């Protein structure tokens, strides 16, 4: 099997990136994101990307999944912005929440032109980079209910 004349001949192209950039324009959560240095946090709630109030940043429900966008000045230019996007997966988050967090992390990457570097942060396996965003972390029992309907 070769790529030519196949259904992956358009993967990796400018057209793929164009189509996905356009799709990311339809998520209200990204409007105004990554405009200044700081940490922005959303939680997945029944497939939706919901902002977390600033006063609660750093507290994470073990039952839930989150997207954390860290905006900072890169070494190359003190007046420009670079991005780390972490998605945080609670020990008890459900499969719909983690999958949506993963997909929407890519979408936020798309929205920001591919610049963000992505980090998968499972509870108990959080990277040094992630830990350093909260100089700390507070894990809370509970979380919001799955968006899945359970097929009996």
């Amino acid at each position: 099997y070769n790529i030519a004349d196949s259904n992956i001949a358009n993967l990796g192209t400018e057209l793929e990136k164009k189509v996905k950039l356009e799709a990311s324009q339809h998520e209200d959560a990204w409007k105004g994101a990554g405009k200044q240095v700081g940490v922005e946090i959303w939680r997945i709630q029944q497939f939706k990307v919901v902002p977390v109030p600033k006063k609660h940043h750093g507290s994470f429900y073990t039952g839930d999944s989150y997207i954390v966008l860290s905006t900072y000045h890169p070494k190359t230019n003190p007046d420009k912005l670079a991005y780390d996007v972490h998605f945080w997966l609670g020990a008890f988050t459900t499969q719909d929440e983690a999958g949506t967090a993963a997909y929407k992390t890519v979408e936020l990457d798309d929205y920001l032109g591919g610049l963000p570097v992505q980090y998968r942060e499972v509870q108990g396996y959080e990277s040094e980079r992630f830990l350093s965003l909260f100089p700390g972390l507070r894990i809370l029992d509970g979380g919001v209910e799955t968006g899945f309907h359970h097929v009996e």
Binding site: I8, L11, G12, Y103, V106, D109, V117, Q118
Partner: peptide, 9 residues
């Protein structure tokens, strides 16, 4: 980072 690498499939 969410993109398949077609040359490696």
């Amino acid at each position: 980072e969410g993109y398949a690498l077609p040359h490696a499939i």
